[PDB]
Amino acid sequence: QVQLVEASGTFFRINDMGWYYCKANRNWGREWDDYWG
Amino acid sequence: TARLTSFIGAIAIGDLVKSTLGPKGMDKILLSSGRDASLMVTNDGATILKNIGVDNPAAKVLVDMSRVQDDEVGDGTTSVTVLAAELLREAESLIAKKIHPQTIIAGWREATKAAREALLSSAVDHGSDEVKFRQDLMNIAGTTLEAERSLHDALCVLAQTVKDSRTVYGGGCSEMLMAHAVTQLANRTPGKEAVAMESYAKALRMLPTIIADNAGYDSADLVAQLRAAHSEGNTTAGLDMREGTIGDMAILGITESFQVKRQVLLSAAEAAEVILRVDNII
Amino acid sequence: TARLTSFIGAIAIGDLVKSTLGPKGMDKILLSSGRDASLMVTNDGATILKNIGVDNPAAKVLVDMSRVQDDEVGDGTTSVTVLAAELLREAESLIAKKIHPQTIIAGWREATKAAREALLSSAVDHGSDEVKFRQDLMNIAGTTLEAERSLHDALCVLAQTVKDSRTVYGGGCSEMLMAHAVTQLANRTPGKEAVAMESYAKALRMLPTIIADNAGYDSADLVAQLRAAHSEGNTTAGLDMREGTIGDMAILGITESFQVKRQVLLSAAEAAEVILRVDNII
Amino acid sequence: SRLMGLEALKSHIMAAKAVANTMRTSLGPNGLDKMMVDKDGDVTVTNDGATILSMMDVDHQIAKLMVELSKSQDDEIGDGTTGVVVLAGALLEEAEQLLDRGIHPIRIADGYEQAARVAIEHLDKISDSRVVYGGGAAEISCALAVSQEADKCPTLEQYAMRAFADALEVIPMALSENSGMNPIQTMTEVRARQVKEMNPALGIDCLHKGTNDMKQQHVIETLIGKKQQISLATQMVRMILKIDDIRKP
Amino acid sequence: TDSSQGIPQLVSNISACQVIAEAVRTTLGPRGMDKLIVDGRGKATISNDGATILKLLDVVHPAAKTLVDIAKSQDAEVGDGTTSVTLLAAEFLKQVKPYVEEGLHPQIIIRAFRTATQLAVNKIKEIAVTDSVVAGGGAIEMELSKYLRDYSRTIPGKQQLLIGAYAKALEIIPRQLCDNAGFDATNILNKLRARHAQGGTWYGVDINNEDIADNFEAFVWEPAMVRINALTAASEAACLIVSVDETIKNPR
Amino acid sequence: DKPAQIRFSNISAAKAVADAIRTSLGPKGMDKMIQDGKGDVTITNDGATILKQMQVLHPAARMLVELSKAQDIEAGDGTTSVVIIAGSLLDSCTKLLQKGIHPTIISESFQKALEKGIEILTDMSRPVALIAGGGAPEIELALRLTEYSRTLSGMESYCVRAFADAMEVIPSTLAENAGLNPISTVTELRNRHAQGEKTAGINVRKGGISNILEELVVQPLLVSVSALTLATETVRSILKIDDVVNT
Amino acid sequence: ETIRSQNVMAAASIANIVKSSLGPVGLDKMLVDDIGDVTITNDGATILKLLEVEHPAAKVLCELADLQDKEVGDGTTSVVIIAAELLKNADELVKQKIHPTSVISGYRLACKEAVRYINENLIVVPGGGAVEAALSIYLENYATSMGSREQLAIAEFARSLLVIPNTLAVNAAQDSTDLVAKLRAFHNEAQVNPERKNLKWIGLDLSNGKPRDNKQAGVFEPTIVKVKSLKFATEAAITILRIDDLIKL
Numbered sequence A: 001q002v003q004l005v006e007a008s009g010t011f012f013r014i015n016d017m018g019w020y021y022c023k024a025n026r027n028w029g030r031e032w033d034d035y036w037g
Numbered sequence B, C: 001t002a003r004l005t006s007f008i009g010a011i012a013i014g015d016l017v018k019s020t021l022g023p024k025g026m027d028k029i030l031l032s033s034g035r036d037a038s039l040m041v042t043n044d045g046a047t048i049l050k051n052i053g054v055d056n057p058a059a060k061v062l063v064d065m066s067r068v069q070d071d072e073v074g075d076g077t078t079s080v081t082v083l084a085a086e087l088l089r090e091a092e093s094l095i096a097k098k099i100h101p102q103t104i105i106a107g108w109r110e111a112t113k114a115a116r117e118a119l120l121s122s123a124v125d126h127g128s129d130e131v132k133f134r135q136d137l138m139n140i141a142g143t144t145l146e147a148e149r150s151l152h153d154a155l156c157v158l159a160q161t162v163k164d165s166r167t168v169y170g171g172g173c174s175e176m177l178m179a180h181a182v183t184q185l186a187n188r189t190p191g192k193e194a195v196a197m198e199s200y201a202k203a204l205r206m207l208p209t210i211i212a213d214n215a216g217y218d219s220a221d222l223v224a225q226l227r228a229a230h231s232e233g234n235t236t237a238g239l240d241m242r243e244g245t246i247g248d249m250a251i252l253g254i255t256e257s258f259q260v261k262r263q264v265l266l267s268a269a270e271a272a273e274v275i276l277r278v279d280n281i282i
Numbered sequence D: 001s002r003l004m005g006l007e008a009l010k011s012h013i014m015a016a017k018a019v020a021n022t023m024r025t026s027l028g029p030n031g032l033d034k035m036m037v038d039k040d041g042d043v044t045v046t047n048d049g050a051t052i053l054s055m056m057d058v059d060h061q062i063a064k065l066m067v068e069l070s071k072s073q074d075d076e077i078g079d080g081t082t083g084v085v086v087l088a089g090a091l092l093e094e095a096e097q098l099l100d101r102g103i104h105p106i107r108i109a110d111g112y113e114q115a116a117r118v119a120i121e122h123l124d125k126i127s128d129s130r131v132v133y134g135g136g137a138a139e140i141s142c143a144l145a146v147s148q149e150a151d152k153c154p155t156l157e158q159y160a161m162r163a164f165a166d167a168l169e170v171i172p173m174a175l176s177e178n179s180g181m182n183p184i185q186t187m188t189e190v191r192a193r194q195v196k197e198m199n200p201a202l203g204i205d206c207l208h209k210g211t212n213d214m215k216q217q218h219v220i221e222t223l224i225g226k227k228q229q230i231s232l233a234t235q236m237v238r239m240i241l242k243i244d245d246i247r248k249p
Numbered sequence E: 001t002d003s004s005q006g007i008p009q010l011v012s013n014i015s016a017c018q019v020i021a022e023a024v025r026t027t028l029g030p031r032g033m034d035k036l037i038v039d040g041r042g043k044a045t046i047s048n049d050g051a052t053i054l055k056l057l058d059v060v061h062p063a064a065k066t067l068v069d070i071a072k073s074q075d076a077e078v079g080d081g082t083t084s085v086t087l088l089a090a091e092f093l094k095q096v097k098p099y100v101e102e103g104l105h106p107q108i109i110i111r112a113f114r115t116a117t118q119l120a121v122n123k124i125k126e127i128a129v130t131d132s133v134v135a136g137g138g139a140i141e142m143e144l145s146k147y148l149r150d151y152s153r154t155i156p157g158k159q160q161l162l163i164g165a166y167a168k169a170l171e172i173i174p175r176q177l178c179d180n181a182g183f184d185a186t187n188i189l190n191k192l193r194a195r196h197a198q199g200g201t202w203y204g205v206d207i208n209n210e211d212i213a214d215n216f217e218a219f220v221w222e223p224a225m226v227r228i229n230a231l232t233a234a235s236e237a238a239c240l241i242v243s244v245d246e247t248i249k250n251p252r
Numbered sequence F: 001d002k003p004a005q006i007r008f009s010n011i012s013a014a015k016a017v018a019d020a021i022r023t024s025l026g027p028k029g030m031d032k033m034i035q036d037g038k039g040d041v042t043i044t045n046d047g048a049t050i051l052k053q054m055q056v057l058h059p060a061a062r063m064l065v066e067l068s069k070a071q072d073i074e075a076g077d078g079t080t081s082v083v084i085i086a087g088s089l090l091d092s093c094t095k096l097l098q099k100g101i102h103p104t105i106i107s108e109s110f111q112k113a114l115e116k117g118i119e120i121l122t123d124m125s126r127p128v129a130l131i132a133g134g135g136a137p138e139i140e141l142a143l144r145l146t147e148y149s150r151t152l153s154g155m156e157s158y159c160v161r162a163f164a165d166a167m168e169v170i171p172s173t174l175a176e177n178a179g180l181n182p183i184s185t186v187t188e189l190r191n192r193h194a195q196g197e198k199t200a201g202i203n204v205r206k207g208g209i210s211n212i213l214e215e216l217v218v219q220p221l222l223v224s225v226s227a228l229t230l231a232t233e234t235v236r237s238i239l240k241i242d243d244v245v246n247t
Numbered sequence G: 001e002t003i004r005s006q007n008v009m010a011a012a013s014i015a016n017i018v019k020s021s022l023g024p025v026g027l028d029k030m031l032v033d034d035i036g037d038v039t040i041t042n043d044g045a046t047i048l049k050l051l052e053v054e055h056p057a058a059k060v061l062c063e064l065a066d067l068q069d070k071e072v073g074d075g076t077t078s079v080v081i082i083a084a085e086l087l088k089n090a091d092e093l094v095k096q097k098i099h100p101t102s103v104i105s106g107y108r109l110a111c112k113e114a115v116r117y118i119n120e121n122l123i124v125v126p127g128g129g130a131v132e133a134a135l136s137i138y139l140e141n142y143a144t145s146m147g148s149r150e151q152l153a154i155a156e157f158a159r160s161l162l163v164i165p166n167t168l169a170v171n172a173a174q175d176s177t178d179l180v181a182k183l184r185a186f187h188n189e190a191q192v193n194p195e196r197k198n199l200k201w202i203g204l205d206l207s208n209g210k211p212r213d214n215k216q217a218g219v220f221e222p223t224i225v226k227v228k229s230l231k232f233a234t235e236a237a238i239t240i241l242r243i244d245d246l247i248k249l
């Protein structure tokens, strides 16, 4: 789905980018989309 | 596509029912049959609609909406046909100036809202004090009068008046007042909906113009005098159809039942809209 | 009799000089000769009048009145031709509605009085404080710019500005303001002279309509936004001919010399009247 | 055999462009109605299908083919049957200018097939409930997708991939029309916004509510109710774009 | 049209057969343009098969009628190859019109569609491979053409430019196979001819991609017997329409 | 009324002075017999003279003929590609006008594209500077402007795309005159440009596309930049022209 | 119709005018003057310097024919015939979407690979119809072993070179198809069979109706006449092909 390097994949958008691990909310985030490092 | 086939039929059904509008309205003679050759002369405006053969399909939406105003109200059958046809005659102009029929409708909706909100504030509920109520009913019965036919019409109007005791003046006071309030609104709306509300107002001022064009008076002058009287605070002026001037419609005893006038406005605007949002006739 | 032979010539001389009105005005190409075949493209509005062969006799009263505005003022040669032709285009309508050409004139006289009395109150005399005066002159020189021809025009306008330091905004502010004041007058005059002042106003609102129709914008919408801004107290709105919206003509630095605008109005109304009171061409 | 060939696909397209141009003025909520008038009837309806399509248009046996194929959309996949006639009309109207260049109809059909594969391959990226957000916004997120992949095709299909992009933007151009808006200006001013800020939910506000963001206006389209429009229209073009003759004894 | 007797009648029959083939040509191939033929009941029939178009078509011309009967006869017993037969027949007729406008005479054109056709079925029965199969999608009409012209070069007499026109009239099956897919025939056919000159007796038009492809390896196969029957039926239809001199329409 | 017929009596009199010079473009350019009024007929394949002696008589036709003169006094050898450009830009303006957008928007969006075109034809360039001729400076224009018309808003990103699509005419005529299939080779050229190759273009001697620049003619920028500039100037001048008035 | 077929028809007309007076035995023509002074003559070398040709294509053909005549005073009536036959076949080619340039490249290749094989027929050239009927087969074999967009313009340069043997046999009352095809059946077993390599001198006989060996019968023709004729007919066909429009002033 989403490969993240510390981002790429089947994404049309990047809503928020944070550091936890690097977190990126890819699509409209309904808690279904959640990608970390 | 029918931007004319569905508009000239409407303005024709409301172009032959006019000239019978005011008190001194012309007549029409109904050559009906070919063998039982019958001549009946009609100063009425509803008989010329329940009798003629409607050929155009858009015209049906007016001829079958006048029955509503006639069998569910009584008086106000030639004013919701003529108002609808002079709304659909200014529509034709706006749609020829490349304005979309879906902005004219959105404009006329706010226009009829500001108009219904305008003759409501000017209604007088004299039904409380029954010494004037007796008087008012006589004015509303005189502004409504084959004999028993007209009498039944007057009875329906009077019944609606006793139910809703609010009364608004007639002869041009109500139409000119609503047109003034619609122009006062169209002077404050930014967008193409202002050319539609000004057009709505120009259509409302066509009822007194036709009431004067039927008594020989100088309508282009009396209607301007009304528009000025109704634009400098005075709100009770109106055609004095006894000497061809403008008179106080309160001291002259020319009143109409608020329900009849509001339903005339509503049915006219609704029919004009229903015939507006029609491209093709299948 | 000439109610058309002496009106369509005028609206034609002012129907080919338009579309070159605003900043982003179209051009015209003058095929002049047959042997010395010459092609000159003109974004100007005065060259298309001092060059064309005027055939209609009524048209002469416009083509020889534009020279006045061009050799005695400088700027304001396409706006007193287009204003006169859209006054004589609404005249044709009023004279087709059976209104006499001697009431249209009496109406337009009070209309131009109430208009000249309207951009006079809105003029700003910043010529006193010469720190803005230096700025104003730059705006008036930018709203006025073959090179030395346009430069001489700008010089005449600037000279008239230093003589009469009153400046009124442009792009539509002045025309829309005068039209608002004329409508505010036409809503208070009883008589057939009101249908003439409303027509005068509709003719004044045709200059910003043509300035927008030349830049591709939605004139039927921008002009309505202007009429609403100028009708709810704001008095400095106007076409912002850089992004197709309405902007404050004060913070945008689009001003015009009050003398040029008032003389445009006066010459336009005077020519329209001089071509109105003409029945026959001998 | 009268009028057969590449001059029979300018008549078949003039025929399937009439049943579409009538249905082009009824898409949005602000869809202008039509009057049903036959030997007996005065119905005023703006909906689709039997209410509009299959009570008219007996001509060229191809309008009868559009109305014959649109029965598959309604009764069967919700009620989205006006968007498939308008989309088919747009695809054929672009094929009209693709044929003038000299592209064999089969090639245009393969191009539309590839572009529909790309579009349906892009709609399923925007399932947000099962659901693709947008009144006029789903057809602008795909037109942007099949325009990029167009230039990655080296054959003549590339032209068809671009015509499919240019025709997918007709749904959010009859939504701009049928209202008091300008079709091109409004369609583009929201197409340039799905790029330069990634939000495929931005679409035409047919209702003048004010926000050009169909995510909050809550105007939605069921996904299988859009995977059909993009498919049933292409499967309708590829049946009208490939028949070469109408013989009538 | 004259259509009186001799050259005029033959040209008329040839034009009628051209029309009846042109009404089916685009249907040839796996993916071919459909046809919307409507009967007298208002039914819309979309069918991309030459058999079901000739059985639903009004044949009111005699030569066209005979061609359509031979095509239906091929469709009845064999099945496959009812539009390739009429295509080959009308092409054989089209490519001898320029020679029948002179006084070449049909009796001689008939002793060119029977020697050449016998030789071509011999070549098929000699080159077929195993039930016996030959590579379709062209790759035969592009080989039988190369063989027939290379053999006609060794014929002293009038049959040289008639077999050489019989051969050239076989290139239509590998032509409209790619003209229906829209593949710029004058290039794929040039490649096929160049590739059949050197070698490649099974190289024919490919439909998945605009290029020649060895059709035997690609398993696009055609039964040798079916090809022989189609060739013989097409040649016999040609000879029939070439052997017709007048149309004796009974007055009543 | 008159505007919408004098923007289509010029765009149909300039688009008929381009489809009389079009198939004379390139090394393998078809000749064109020229029938003089006396009667003798001469044969030339250069568009300069055909325009020189043509008896155009139309305002826009003359505007386009005086464009060849300006182009050969400014760059020397562009005298039939600039006319083809400024006739296909007007072809595109014929469809952009039926849509209903105003000529003062297809005149401020061409200069919005020409200024980007200037910055596309100065990146291909090999700084000596020279640009890879043959069709590259136009397929690259089409591709890059179509990519750039997707970042533009309003009526702007509808005429810039028409600019790009009208650039694909000189490659089409060069491919036709070279005996190729124009549409197929133009699509292959665009697919070869998107993949990075900027030197591509119709090699007319071989008879097909080529990347090696040794036998791929290279031209100065001045000719291509001048062609774009003068063609955009001329189409802007023709679009903003209505009402041919006789004085 | 286009103005390329008109040029082809003009060249064909002047051909048909000259082509019945080709061989040693050939009928005459009468050239009516302005006053009416008639000159009856064969030997088209004069029929081309006296014919009233007004069409531009016929004019260019006459100019190149006279250029050839003054270069070498022989083979000027065969240049016109070969050129008009090249033009006929090139028009038939162009009328099936073969650009005139591909046909011109094909004619260049053929005229360049024909004089590089006439130098395998030279000793002088056998003459009669030998070189033509030999180049026919050689070029029909060389075309297929190339496979380019111009592989069809060399096989219409090989079947259009046998217009000389095909009009040298109607001007001898023998035949058109039979005699030329016996000629093109002897030259086949001179490029297929290596033993019978001396069958490449077998031209045709204009006295009897049967092809004979034009080396054992002394009917030679100088090589620089046949080469010049093929090289001028090719340039004539090319010059009339590269025009595609007539500009009216």
Ligand SMILES: Nc1ncnc2c1ncn2[C@@H]1O[C@H](COP(=O)(O)OP(=O)(O)O)[C@@H](O)[C@H]1O
Pocket (backbone or CB within 6 Å): B020, B021, B022, B023, B045, B074, B075, B076, B077, B078, B079, B142, B143, B144, B145, B170, B171, B172, B211, B239, B240, B241, B254, B256
């Ligand atoms: N005496 C009167 N003076 C002035 N106006 C009148 C008088 N009587 C009727 N009217 C006006 O004439 C209009 C037409 O009414 P009428 O024709 O009687 O019935 P309907 O309302 O059905 O047309 C009404 O709007 C009313 O205001």
Ligand SMILES: Nc1ncnc2c1ncn2[C@@H]1O[C@H](COP(=O)(O)OP(=O)(O)O)[C@@H](O)[C@H]1O
Pocket (backbone or CB within 6 Å): C020, C021, C022, C023, C045, C074, C075, C076, C077, C078, C079, C142, C143, C144, C145, C170, C171, C172, C211, C239, C240, C241, C254, C256
């Ligand atoms: N930059 C600008 N922005 C808005 N309006 C302008 C601008 N420049 C000129 N105008 C308007 O264009 C109108 C036409 O002026 P112009 O054609 O330049 O000379 P003339 O006044 O002789 O027609 C003027 O009324 C002016 O208000």
Ligand SMILES: Nc1ncnc2c1ncn2[C@@H]1O[C@H](COP(=O)(O)OP(=O)(O)O)[C@@H](O)[C@H]1O
Pocket (backbone or CB within 6 Å): D026, D027, D028, D029, D031, D046, D047, D048, D079, D080, D081, D082, D083, D134, D135, D136, D171, D175, D204, D205, D206, D207, D219, D220, D221
């Ligand atoms: N409130 C709305 N705002 C914007 N677009 C809408 C709205 N409601 C529906 N649409 C759009 O209208 C189109 C559907 O047209 P419709 O009349 O429903 O056709 P059908 O007859 O096929 O149901 C779709 O593109 C849909 O996205």
Ligand SMILES: Nc1ncnc2c1ncn2[C@@H]1O[C@H](COP(=O)(O)OP(=O)(O)O)[C@@H](O)[C@H]1O
Pocket (backbone or CB within 6 Å): E027, E028, E029, E030, E050, E079, E080, E081, E082, E083, E084, E136, E137, E138, E173, E177, E205, E206, E207, E220, E222
């Ligand atoms: N997959 C394929 N690839 C290439 N050619 C094919 C293919 N399938 C069929 N063909 C060719 O198409 C021709 C026509 O066959 P078709 O029209 O399908 O049936 P029929 O042989 O009855 O006409 C045949 O000669 C065959 O060689």
Ligand SMILES: Nc1ncnc2c1ncn2[C@@H]1O[C@H](COP(=O)(O)OP(=O)(O)O)[C@@H](O)[C@H]1O
Pocket (backbone or CB within 6 Å): F024, F025, F026, F027, F029, F045, F046, F047, F048, F077, F078, F079, F080, F081, F133, F134, F135, F170, F174, F202, F203, F204, F217
């Ligand atoms: N060797 C070549 N290969 C490909 N294209 C060429 C070649 N030489 C010139 N061109 C093209 O020809 C066009 C120049 O026009 P041209 O026909 O040379 O004008 P003129 O008619 O004055 O000769 C340009 O598009 C250029 O790319």
Ligand SMILES: Nc1ncnc2c1ncn2[C@@H]1O[C@H](COP(=O)(O)OP(=O)(O)O)[C@@H](O)[C@H]1O
Pocket (backbone or CB within 6 Å): G021, G022, G023, G024, G073, G074, G075, G076, G077, G078, G127, G128, G129, G164, G168, G204, G205, G206, G219, G221
């Ligand atoms: N005696 C002959 N027998 C056979 N062929 C001949 C004879 N004389 C001439 N020919 C052929 O006729 C052809 C045409 O020659 P002709 O038209 O008479 O003069 P030109 O050489 O000027 O064309 C020549 O190519 C030649 O080979």
Ligand SMILES: [Mg+2]
Pocket (backbone or CB within 6 Å): B075, B076, B143, B144, B145
């Ligand atoms: Mg009443």
Ligand SMILES: [Mg+2]
Pocket (backbone or CB within 6 Å): C075, C076, C143, C144, C145
């Ligand atoms: Mg100025």
Ligand SMILES: [Mg+2]
Pocket (backbone or CB within 6 Å): D079, D080
């Ligand atoms: Mg729906």
Ligand SMILES: [Mg+2]
Pocket (backbone or CB within 6 Å): E079, E080, E081, E082
């Ligand atoms: Mg089969």
Ligand SMILES: [Mg+2]
Pocket (backbone or CB within 6 Å): F077, F078
């Ligand atoms: Mg050059």
Ligand SMILES: [Mg+2]
Pocket (backbone or CB within 6 Å): G074, G075
């Ligand atoms: Mg000789």
